[PDB]
Design a protein around this ligand. Structure first.
Ligand SMILES: CCCCCCCCCCCCCCCCCC(=O)O
Ligand SMILES: CCCCCCCCCCCCCCCCCC(=O)O
Ligand SMILES: N[C@@H](CCC(=O)N[C@@H](CS)C(=O)NCC(=O)O)C(=O)O
Ligand SMILES: N[C@@H](CCC(=O)N[C@@H](CS)C(=O)NCC(=O)O)C(=O)O
Ligand SMILES: [K+]
Ligand SMILES: [K+]
Ligand SMILES: [K+]
Ligand SMILES: [K+]
Ligand SMILES: [K+]
Ligand SMILES: [K+]
Ligand SMILES: [K+]
Lengths: 48, 243, 244, 271, 49, 48, 271, 243, 48
């Protein structure tokens, strides 16, 4: 996978010149998968 | 820009070069390394494993029979049983062994060799044989008396079915060429010598027992063995595209 | 004492489940790649369902039909787990699950007399392909419990040298010395688990390299028997029974 | 359950001086190949030896040193300005035989591409032309022509270079869905099918194809291409018995039976 | 000049390459990032829907 | 032989881009040469 | 058992002022060449000298400075698109004579290859073509044709470049099986043979051959190749008497007898 | 990529260049360096070793005889025995010596020279001779009187068979060209002078003894000698491919 | 002459790749010029 050690020096003035970002993580998808006001726990019934 | 001066070699494609290069998939994350038995890190681990020598490479021997050294009840003394050049990389009985295949992937070798023999006659079949290693200088020994002047082991058939004759590394130089090709390179210079086997006493059997028996021959590199300069194995070839 | 004197005792007892195998003429015991069978680690696993671990019901010795060491005998082989796919609860667990993982304990038997001579190579080969034919027959790639006879022993049925099969876990049954071979085999694959009906991880071969001969008049009928025990097994992906 | 240790070494073993031995106790020479173990008789036990501080290395036989160099894996000429090469290493025997020395192996690879223009009579031309090599993973649409839309290559990786520039070169990671590539597979490609043509091939070893074209149409000439592959960062398991018969097919290990490997000699007693 | 040796791959255009390159507008200053709902950082966030 | 001093900096993101490994050692071959349960010392007979 | 020391110096020896000497004791001028020793009479003892702080260096005569530059070792043209050159430095006399100034020597080498296309009349062409130089160690199969399988070069090292690129260049280590190369060998190449053609050649000095081809077929033209070699990291032993007769053969030091080395003059009394 | 600007010289192949380059066998491990007598690190170690001057380079002298300076019982006084330009790199008696060969591999030289002479007549043969070094400016001295005004040594034949005449480095410049080629470069500018030998008394012998004898002439560089600018030795050439 | 300051970093794995050695000194030539057992001082006669 990705190297734990590698050179990352910027040679140019503008950030647009920089190489690709190297984060690549993901975030909890709840804003898309469960955009609801009331919490509906996995162990309970959804509606009552 | 930083001033630079490019040099000879620029743009060349050396097959053994070792540079860093852009990856086609820079963010790719491979599957995890799992626990698998039998990891090997160096092929010296493989050549140290004994494999069978195709010793009886004669017209009358086909397939599996070529691994058997013929032994039989004698009616004369001090007779010869077999002979072989010890060189692991030359054409012959050694070329199809594990040791031979890898040696043939290299140009030079060094190290002692393990030649082990297993007797396969009946439990009642006895015998004593002498196996000798003749360091180079002349031709293979002509008789048992000449052979026994070199490095050797006297083997007694018994419960422990096998014997080992170590062909110790005895060479002028630290390494030897793996081929003895003479016409072009004059590599006969490197010949490592011979291994010969003779009846020390005789193969003896009870009434009506098989009067012939077999010995299987094993060979492997010792712990002080190494190889240098990789080269393409001459046994692997093709004349056209494969089906 | 074998340990004190530094030698291997010729007697052995193999006990797994409700089965015990003994021999009085062994030649030590081989443990493939120096590794005993082990369970799948949480860090290597991928299938998420809780596995079935049958225990003694499947981890025991199964004896297959014997094979005769005939005068023209070229050798015989058995694929694993194929050979035991229809035997006992091991076979049932193999059929009812998509995934299987396991090791083995193999005991090959062949006794004659001190008046006989002959030598069998007993080798367990990982990923042993029967590829001597342009289009391999299923009857030969998966011969089942009966196993299949060798047709090309010198080339090991795969285009390699028989003499180099020693690079794989093996022993020899040299009649003057021993009458049995025992090999412990760990699971080997490029995957954590695999299908027991589509892939045979190991192939057990018993090949005569020194023909069977004997004092005139001795018993001529000499069988070769294979007894195999699954060891440290686990299965995933339960469903109805499915065979290849 | 590993009972046998594997200590590492950077040089071969030294030789220590030894003296004579006349006893009924120690018998290093007596062996028993039936056990499956290789002889453990040492040089020092079989003959009287001298001290040898042996500094011979073991580097050139490491997996990295043995596999770590480029070898030809593909060679072809475009037709209609295009060529589709299914990625597999069975076409050219040298690298193939090397890989089959291991049962399983993980490694990254460095691919190097050498291309030039040739005419209808296969005579090389001094002609600089831009060419494109596109990696099409299984499931992605393969272009039928030199100017099909797939060449847009918005997702498929592509490398565009010129016959007038040095050979193109890119590294690829260990891409198999498995935890190692398999160079020997005793099984079938699918459930419900036991035809011989589906035996001995592990599908996960096939990562797709390389499609090549010249960016614009050549006039009467063609693009000749050679693809080389160099394994890197090799990890291997379970050494195998080396190929001892000629290869005959690109996808199977089928072979012609033989009664001998080495050539015959007059007699077993004459070296 | 510092001695250098250029290697295979030189001049090639790998579509997945990742180098730094001169900017057409070196002193350009983009509009500020404002608060917009629904930011997504990885498409795994989408396939889980 | 190999240099005791040489530069080893990674310029790329993925480890696949790195140059060849520089270990090259060998390990005791016992797992292949002597894969047996009972130790059989060199000075003793193999079987009893 | 070294009784004579060898202290190192980075500059030649200074001159120290000296005065007259009238004595029966010290007689620096009296010598005896029979002993095998070179005179030890110093400048200061033979004449009255002045002080000279001599900072003249000794760098350009070091083995590294003397040998450390490229010299031609091979020059040929392909035939049928291929050429097989046995690696040896006896073909071109300049580098050969230099090496023979030492009996034994260890060194790495930098090989530089300069190639260009020429036509049937040996006229150079401005034509860029890819060429391959493969090192085939002894025992490995040598390709018979421009398109034989050995060119796959999966194990043999190969360097592929273009006549349009700068000269190719690669370094090679000290490869002999011996502990030093030998530039003088009073022995035979094998046991059991005393033929003259097997005398004076040490086989370990021959590491194989370089086979060259153009990757694709040239149309009526050929590839002209020059190979240069530059010793590096030189360690040498036992200086030798310099060659004083023309070379005649590539593999032997055979020569034509002569009654003089320098040309004659009218008389010994006229300088 | 780091911005760069390639410069003049790029791609050129200077035979004396000194760059690092990829190795064909990156993991190769050479044989060990063993103890071998006679290691040499600099060729100045070789030119300081005395070798014979081919001094009698005349028509009547062939082979080995060319190393012998003829001496004979005189019937006149102050006569001349030999003469030679001291320049180590020019064509002549010095060209085949160790000093001469290496000097001919370079364009410039500096340093004092050791000229040693060994008398080889009988034990009963006596004599005194004067050997002189004439620094440049004119022609070689015409007689003993003129010669003795320069640097010289008077040699007495006796038990110690040899004598050394040091030709001290006496030059306007720190170095001299190794050739005196005039037509093109006008290098006669560098002429180092002459060495001449004369009878100081006479060679005297007992009755019936050989009335002729020989002197062997040796030459070597002194410890303050050095060479600069390597060049191809003009003596080594070829007109075609070698057999 | 030679620079008292200059870069000397090795970019390659094998020492054979390194640039030329930069020592270039000479050693006392006695092993070649005076390989004798008995010392013969400059101020004395060689033989007695
Ligand atoms: C756009 C750049 C093109 C470069 C080529 C990329 C190739 C990607 C495929 C990598 C897979 C290589 C491993 C295959 C090994 C198995 C071979 C076989 O069993 O036949
Ligand atoms: C693929 C790259 C090609 C480069 C050439 C590699 C050559 C390898 C051989 C090196 C051996 C050189 C030493 C020979 C010295 C002895 C010469 C002689 O005695 O004639
Ligand atoms: N002569 C045909 C066939 C040549 C060919 O396919 N050669 C195979 C071996 S049979 C090879 O491996 N060639 C290596 C190479 O040319 O690089 C052609 O040039 O198109
Ligand atoms: N004229 C012929 C022969 C020339 C040749 O072989 N020259 C030899 C010397 S006789 C040489 O060393 N040439 C050096 C060079 O051309 O680089 C040709 O050009 O093919
Ligand atoms: K259980
Ligand atoms: K060691
Ligand atoms: K033993
Ligand atoms: K051994
Ligand atoms: K000084
Ligand atoms: K003296
Ligand atoms: K001197």
């Amino acid at each position: 996978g990705s190297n734990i050690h590698y050179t990352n020096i910027n040679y140019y003035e503008n950030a647009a010149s920089n190489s690709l970002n190297k984060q690549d993580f993901t975030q909890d998808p709840e804003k898309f998968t469960r955009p609801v006001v009331d919490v509906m726990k996995e162990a309970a019934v959804p509606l009552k | 820009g930083i001033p630079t001066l490019y040099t000879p070699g620029s743009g060349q494609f050396l097959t053994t070069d070792d540079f860093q290069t852009p990856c086609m998939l820079p963010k790719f994350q491979p599957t995890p390394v799992i626990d698998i038995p039998g990891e090997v890190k160096n092929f010296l681990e493989v050549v140290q494993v004994e494999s069978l020598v195709e010793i009886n490479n004669v017209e009358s021997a086909e397939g599996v029979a070529r691994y058997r050294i013929p032994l039989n009840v004698q009616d004369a003394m001090d007779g010869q049983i077999m002979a072989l050049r010890v060189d692991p990389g030359i054409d012959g009985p050694m070329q199809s062994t594990l040791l031979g295949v890898f040696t043939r992937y290299y140009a030079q070798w060094s190290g002692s060799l393990d030649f082990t023999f297993m007797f396969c006659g009946t439990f009642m079949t006895t015998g004593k044989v002498i196996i000798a290693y003749t360091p180079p200088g002349g031709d293979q020994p002509t008789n048992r008396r000449q052979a026994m002047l070199g490095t050797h082991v006297v083997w007694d058939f018994g419960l422990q079915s096998s014997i080992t004759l170590v062909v110790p590394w005895i060479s002028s130089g630290h390494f030897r060429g793996t081929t003895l090709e003479n016409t072009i390179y004059k590599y006969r210079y490197y010949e490592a010598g011979y291994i010969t086997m003779w009846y020390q006493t005789n193969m003896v059997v009870p009434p009506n027992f098989p009067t012939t028996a077999s010995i299987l021959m094993f060979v492997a590199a010792q712990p002080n063995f190494s190889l240098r300069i990789l080269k393409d194995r001459p046994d692997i070839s093709q004349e056209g595209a494969l089906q | 004492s074998a340990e004190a004197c530094g030698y291997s005792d010729r007697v052995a007892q193999l006990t797994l489940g409700n089965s015990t195998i003994t021999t009085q003429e062994a030649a030590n015991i081989v443990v493939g790649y120096g590794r005993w069978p082990t369970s799948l680690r949480d860090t290597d696993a991928t299938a998420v369902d809780k596995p079935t671990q049958p225990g003694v019901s499947a981890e025991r010795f199964y004896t297959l039909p014997s094979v005769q060491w005939t005068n023209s005998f070229k050798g015989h082989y058995w694929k694993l787990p194929d050979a035991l796919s229809e035997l006992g609860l091991f076979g049932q667990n193999l059929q009812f699950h998509y995934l299987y993982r396991g090791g083995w304990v193999i005991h090959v038997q062949c006794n004659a007399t001190k008046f006989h001579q002959g030598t069998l190579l007993v080798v367990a080969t990982p990923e042993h392909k029967i590829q001597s034919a342009e289009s391999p027959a299923f009857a030969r790639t998966n011969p089942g419990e009966q196993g299949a006879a060798y047709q090309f022993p010198f080339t090991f049925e795969d285009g390699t040298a028989l003499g180099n099969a020693l690079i794989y876990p093996h022993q020899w049954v040299n009649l003057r010395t021993n009458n049995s071979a025992t090999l412990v085999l760990p699971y080997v694959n490029a995957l954590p688990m695999d299908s027991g009906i589509r892939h045979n991880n190991w192939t057990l071969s018993v090949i005569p390299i020194v023909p069977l001969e004997y004092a005139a008049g001795a018993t001529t009928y000499v069988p070769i028997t294979v007894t195999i025990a699954p060891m440290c097994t686990e299965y995933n992906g339960l469903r109805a029974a499915v065979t290849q | 359950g590993q009972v046998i240790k594997s200590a590492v070494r950077s040089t071969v073993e030294n030789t220590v001086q030894s003296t004579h031995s006349i006893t009924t106790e120690a018998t290093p020479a007596l062996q028993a190949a039936e056990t499956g173990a290789t002889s453990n008789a040492s040089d020092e036990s079989m003959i009287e030896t001298r001290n040898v501080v042996n500094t011979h290395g073991v580097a050139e036989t490491s997996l990295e040193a043995f596999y770590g160099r480029a070898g030809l894996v593909a060679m072809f000429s475009t037709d209609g300005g295009i060529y589709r090469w299914y990625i597999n290493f069975g076409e050219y025997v040298q690298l193939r035989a090397k890989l089959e020395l291991l049962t399983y192996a993980r490694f990254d690879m460095e691919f190097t591409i050498v291309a030039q223009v040739v005419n209808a009579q296969s005579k090389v031309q001094d002609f600089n032309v831009d060419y494109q090599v596109m990696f099409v993973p299984p499931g992605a649409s393969v272009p039928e022509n030199q100017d099909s839309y797939q060449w847009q290559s918005s997702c498929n990786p592509s490398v565009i270079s010129n016959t007038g520039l040095p050979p193109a070169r890119v590294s690829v990671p260990f891409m198999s869905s498995a935890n190692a590539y398999s160079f020997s597979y005793d099984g079938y490609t699918q459930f419900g099918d036991t035809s011989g043509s589906s035996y001995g091939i592990v599908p996960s070893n096939y990562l797709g194809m390389l499609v090549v074209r010249t960016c614009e149409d050549l006039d009467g000439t063609r693009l000749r291409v050679r693809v080389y592959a160099k394994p890197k960062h090799v990890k291997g398991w379970i050494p195998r018995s080396p190929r001892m018969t000629p290869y005959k097919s690109r996808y199977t290990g089928v072979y012609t039976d033989t009664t001998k490997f080495c050539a015959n000699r007059a007699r077993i007693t004459t070296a």
